[PDB]
Amino acid sequence: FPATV
Amino acid sequence: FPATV
Amino acid sequence: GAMGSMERASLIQKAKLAEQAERYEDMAAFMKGAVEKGEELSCEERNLLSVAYKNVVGGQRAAWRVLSSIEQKSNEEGSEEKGPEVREYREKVETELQGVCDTVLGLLDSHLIKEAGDAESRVFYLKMKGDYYRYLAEVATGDDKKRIIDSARSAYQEAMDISKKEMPPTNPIRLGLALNFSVFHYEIANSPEEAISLAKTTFDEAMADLHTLSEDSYKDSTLIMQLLRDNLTLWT
Amino acid sequence: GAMGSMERASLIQKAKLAEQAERYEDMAAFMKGAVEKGEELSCEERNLLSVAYKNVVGGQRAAWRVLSSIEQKSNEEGSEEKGPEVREYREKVETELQGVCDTVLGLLDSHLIKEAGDAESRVFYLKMKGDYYRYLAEVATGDDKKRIIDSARSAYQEAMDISKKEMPPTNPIRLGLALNFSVFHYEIANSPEEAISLAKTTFDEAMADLHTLSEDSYKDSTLIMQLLRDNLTLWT
Ligand SMILES: C=CC(C)(C)OC[C@H]1O[C@H](O[C@@H]2C3=C(C(C)C)C[C@H](O)[C@]3(C)/C=C3/[C@@H](COC)CC[C@H]3[C@@H](C)[C@H]2O)[C@H](O)[C@@H](O)[C@@H]1O
Ligand SMILES: C=CC(C)(C)OC[C@H]1O[C@H](O[C@@H]2C3=C(C(C)C)C[C@H](O)[C@]3(C)/C=C3/[C@@H](COC)CC[C@H]3[C@@H](C)[C@H]2O)[C@H](O)[C@@H](O)[C@@H]1O
Ligand SMILES: [Mg+2]
Ligand SMILES: [Mg+2]
Ligand SMILES: [Mg+2]
Ligand SMILES: [Mg+2]
Ligand SMILES: [Mg+2]
Ligand SMILES: [Mg+2]
């Protein structure tokens, strides 16, 4: 999965 | 801590 | 509210203890109680709220993905029927996740967003609103899925518009908003070109503003910039 | 019981799904429901029960230790008074942990132990009984602390006596029982010499029985033997 903050 | 199972 | 009898300062203190113990469900409940006292949250308090719910729903999302994967395999050609249990348990996790998202969106709507006037609070809460609609969209299937996606988009867009007018390109909230909206475009809205364009423009404009920063602000900022780069590398 | 309407086989199936998703609270609730159907558990089912509760209470214990450490520092010379909150939150976690231990001990007493006749089930459940009294002992302070310690000791001892009469020295349950009873001696009962003696004798007698085993049984067994060795290295 791509990175989120 | 020591190991337990 | 089970936290109604506890002092606001005690709830904040206990949220910090729960964070240290990695007790994110407790942390989230303490911060819900604090929000429900009716006073605005400070910068530090906003981060406690967001981290608590991000971790609760993050664990739910990970579990949902495990179960959804098992369920999809159970519905492939040649798979032995194994009854309703996988669907039922996936639905149980999904309903709990939706409940937590609804709770966070309710806190944002009653009344964190309406009282947030400074850019750093308003953008923060609108980002959270986009995030929790995005998590609802990840599990959505029915008549309202498009409305859920559009609710995420609308919240992220309002946050974007404020962030570009009121915050420097290196502001960590502005950067994190862009990171997550880019992921929304890629994973939710079927818009990979928009996702890539947003991540690249955000990265490049932040690079050009780093020279204005102290060492500590540079460290913050560059950390989120690396996440933008990581996503671009995954996508190109 | 909220699981009273669900089929036993569905509860077992969902416990396995919860394990795959690392949803140990759900896993434990499914297996409590399965136990409450009143039928004995198979070998595989026993492991689902033990792993679920071991992980639930393990997380509680880790959080309790974080909070107890903060609390102890808050009571050192020179520490600023910070109010009742650390004690209160430590107590909250402690009460939840005690509740889970009481639930497991209740399942063992109603009626898993009394129906367990084969060595591999009886030793298993008595080991669990020692384990959950040991976790109660880790947080105990009052009039009944000695009785809690003695309850752990008594359960471990009965399990030990059966294991030595009915199981080979390499049996994984026998080995794990010895590992945990040795830890009880070291950490709970203030008996490090007994802890070391038990770990060493258990290790040496298992070493001497490995020649009787298949490759797969050797792999099991040797894995727990390494934990005995690890503890001996920590203690000597
Ligand atoms: C629980 C609170 C504790 C552990 C004390 O602090 C967490 C972090 O809070 C700050 O980082 C923040 C922070 C992160 C940085 C580590 C990238 C990840 C967190 O998801 C958090 C709180 C979230 C957000 C997003 C919130 O969108 C609603 C927008 C970007 C970023 C901003 C707010 C960063 O500024 C400190 O600058 C870090 O040092 C510190 O690790
Ligand atoms: C949740 C169930 C899943 C993940 C499917 O299985 C877990 C493990 O169950 C078996 O190991 C068992 C097992 C462990 C071994 C990995 C050492 C650690 C677990 O705490 C468990 C279930 C527990 C016990 C203790 C229980 O005292 C009440 C006594 C020793 C040991 C015995 C029972 C081992 O035999 C398999 O032999 C492993 O391969 C497998 O990983
Ligand atoms: Mg007050
Ligand atoms: Mg549903
Ligand atoms: Mg644009
Ligand atoms: Mg039936
Ligand atoms: Mg107490
Ligand atoms: Mg002896």
Q: Backbone phi, then psi, for D170, in 5-degree steps?
A: -95, 0
Structure tokens at D179: 């590992």
Residue C39: count of CB within 10 angstroms of its CB = 11
Structure tokens at C123: 């953008």
- Decide: residue D26, CB within 10 A, 0-12 exposed, 13-18 middle, 19+ buried: buried
Is the distance from the beta carbon of residue D50 to the nearest atom of ligand 2 less than 6 Å? yes
CB contact at 8 A, D177 and D159: yes
Which is nearest to C158 in space by CA: C193, C204, C108? C108
Q: What angle do CA D100, D105, D110 make, to 5 degrees?
A: 125
**Residue C83: its chain D contacts at CB < 8 A?**
10, 13
D228 to each of C124, D170, D186, D187, D233, how far by Cα in Å?
A: 51, 12, 13, 15, 9
C215 to each of C204, D11, D80, D196, how far by Cα in Å?
A: 19, 55, 32, 52
Sign of CA dihedral C191, C195, C196, C200: positive
Q: How far is the CA of D198 from the centre of ligand 8 (A)?
A: 7
Three-state secondary structure call for residue C3: coil
CB contact at 8 A, C130 and C159: yes
All residues with CB under 5 Å from ion ligand 6: D 7
**Ligand 2: which atom is nearest the Cα of residue D220?**
37
Structure tokens at C47: 């981060």
Please tell me the distance from the alpha carbon of residue D57 to that of residue D185, in angstroms, as a whole number.
20
Please tell me the distance from the alpha carbon of residue C63 to that of residue C42, in angstroms, as a whole number.
32
Domains of chain D, residue spans = 8-235
CB contact at 8 A, C71 and C88: no
Please tell me the distance from the alpha carbon of residue D107 to that of residue D125, in angstroms, as a whole number.
10
* CB-side neighbour CA atoms (13 Å) of C134: 27
Which is nearest to C159 in space by CA: C122, C209, C208, C104? C122
**Residue D230: its chain B contacts at CB < 8 A?**
2-3
What residue type is C133 in one-letter code? Y
User: Nearest CA to CA, how far is C59 from chain D (Å)?
Assistant: 9
Of all ligands present, the nearest one to the C-alpha of C219 is 1
Structure tokens at C85: 């249990």
In total, chain D counts a number of residues equal to: 236
Is the distance from the beta carbon of residue C51 to the nearest atom of ligand 1 less than 6 Å? yes
User: Nearest CA to CA, how far is D180 from chain B (Å)?
Assistant: 5
Q: What is the DSSP letter of D210?
A: G
Three-state secondary structure call for residue D38: coil
Please tell me the distance from the alpha carbon of residue D236 to that of residue D231, in angstroms, as a whole number.
9
Residue C109: count of CB within 10 angstroms of its CB = 12
Please tell me the distance from the alpha carbon of residue D167 to that of residue D170, in angstroms, as a whole number.
8
CB contact at 8 A, D69 and D86: no
Q: How far is the CA of C17 from the centre of ligand 3 (A)?
A: 20
Nearest-CB residue to A2 (from C176, C183, C224): C183
Residue D158: count of CB within 10 angstroms of its CB = 17
What residue type is D107 in one-letter code? L
SS (HEC) of C192-204: HHHHHHHHHHHHH
Instruction: Say which residues have a Cβ less than 8 Å from residue C119's Cβ, sequence separation at least 6.
Output: C162, C163, C165, C166, C167
Q: How was this structure determined?
A: X-ray
**Is 1.20.190.20 the CATH classification of the domain at C8-235?**
yes
Task: State the resolution, in angstroms.
Answer: 1.4
